[PDB]
Design a protein around this nucleic acid. Structure first.
Ligand code: SF4
Ligand SMILES: [Ca+2]
Ligand SMILES: [Ca+2]
Length: 352
DNA sequence: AAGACGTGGAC
DNA sequence: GTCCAAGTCT
């Protein structure tokens, strides 16, 4: 009630007009391209995402293009970006738009939000940017800026807190330009109101900041500490044959690293025993392995893989039954692999 | 709800 | 080495 919204809006939107970064998705306001950027940015950094966006749109320039495309090429476009469920959900959602909504991204929040991958941030980011809808796009940058502006001491993970934020944004938003107001809060947490050592003396909205006044900015926002993750020992065989082809396999449609290709992998601490028993269980397949060559960790949010690579060679009497395949070295670059098994191949290739 | 779900920028 | 990124599934 004592907050000068209109003055806060003049200062934020002037700063934004000067200091807004030139990013590939800011060249226009196509609902599709905003949506694609919003999804790619989820838990991924702007610098990390820039080259991906440029390549994705080249392969898939329109909503209709991504929907007519095969799930395999859609995934190879996301290769290395992580959280790969976003792209299977984004691909499924663009199909629903083509059918039910006639290739026009919905502009009703509740219809858009009913598409897969579209949550409260994606709803705000697409509808406000491309359609002028005044829906808050409350991401990690906004929570940190708002918790500092308004001294929100509560865990930003709580639904009550996320409601407080949504309501703050509805009060203070500039309904003249919902998009730029939403995009400017983000840019401010990205370039000024940073997590560690914020640039408060370089901030256009320092006068309106309550955490600046009390000198508690560094203590906010309030997020929980990560509890240790499980460590998962993994044995990986890079098997070749006399023709040079490498044995690979595709992972399940459901689970971790779904529908990605990997080298045969097993639980573990003998390893060389558990891996031969597995490849030998395939029809017409005989394996003799060597001594390991590298052992590296690969981190996930929820767990950490402790990988160990065992080189070797393979003799197959006949056709390698799916899910396995034999692929020349030249042709590994076509399949989509997780970053962990991209490393597995580097450490095997330099080992020669 | 709680946890599953990838990776690396930026210090 | 540590945090968390323009978060979402259900
Ligand atoms: S004054 Fe400091 S803490 Fe407050 S919004 Fe600006 S950068 Fe963030
Ligand atoms: Ca939703
Ligand atoms: Ca599975």
């Amino acid at each position: 009630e004592r907050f000068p919204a209109r003055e806060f809006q003049r200062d934020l939107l002037d700063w934004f007009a000067r200091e807004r970064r030139d990013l590939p998705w800011r060249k226009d306001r196509d609902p599709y391209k905003v949506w694609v950027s919003s999804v790619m940015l989820q838990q991924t950094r702007v610098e990390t995402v820039i080259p991906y966006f440029e390549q994705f749109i080249d392969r898939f320039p329109t909503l209709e293009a991504l929907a007519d495309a095969d799930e395999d090429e859609v995934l190879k476009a996301w290769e290395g970006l992580g959280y790969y469920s976003r792209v299977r959900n984004l691909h499924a959602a663009v199909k629903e738009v083509k059918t039910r909504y006639g290739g026009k991204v919905p502009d009703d929040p509740d219809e858009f939000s009913r598409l897969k991958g579209v949550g409260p941030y994606t709803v705000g980011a697409v509808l406000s940017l491309a359609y002028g809808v005044p829906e808050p796009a409350v991401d990690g940058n906004v929570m940190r800026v708002l918790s500092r502006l308004f001294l929100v001491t509560d865990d930003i993970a709580k639904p009550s807190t996320r409601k407080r934020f949504e309501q703050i944004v509805r009060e203070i938003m500039a309904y003249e330009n919902p998009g730029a107001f939403n995009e400017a809060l983000i840019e401010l947490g990205a370039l000024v109101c940073t997590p560690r050592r914020p640039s408060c003396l370089l901030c256009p909205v320092q006068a309106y900041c309550q955490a600046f006044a009390e000198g508690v900015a560094e203590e906010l926002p309030v997020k929980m500490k990560k509890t240790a993750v499980k460590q998962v020992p993994l044995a990986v065989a890079v098997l070749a044959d006399d023709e040079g082809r490498v044995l690979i396999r595709k992972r399940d449609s459901t689970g971790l690293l779904a529908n990605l290709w990997e080298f045969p992998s097993c639980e573990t601490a003998d390893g060389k025993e558990k891996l031969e028993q597995m490849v030998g269980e395939q029809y017409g397949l005989q394996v003799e392995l060597t001594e390991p060559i590298v052992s590296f960790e690969h981190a996930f949010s929820h767990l950490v893989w402790q990988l160990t690579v065992f080189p070797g060679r393979l003799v197959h009497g006949g056709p390698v039954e799916e899910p396995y395949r034999l692929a020349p070295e030249d042709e590994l670059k076509a399949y989509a692999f997780p970053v962990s098994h991209q490393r597995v191949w580097r450490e095997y290739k330099e080992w020669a």
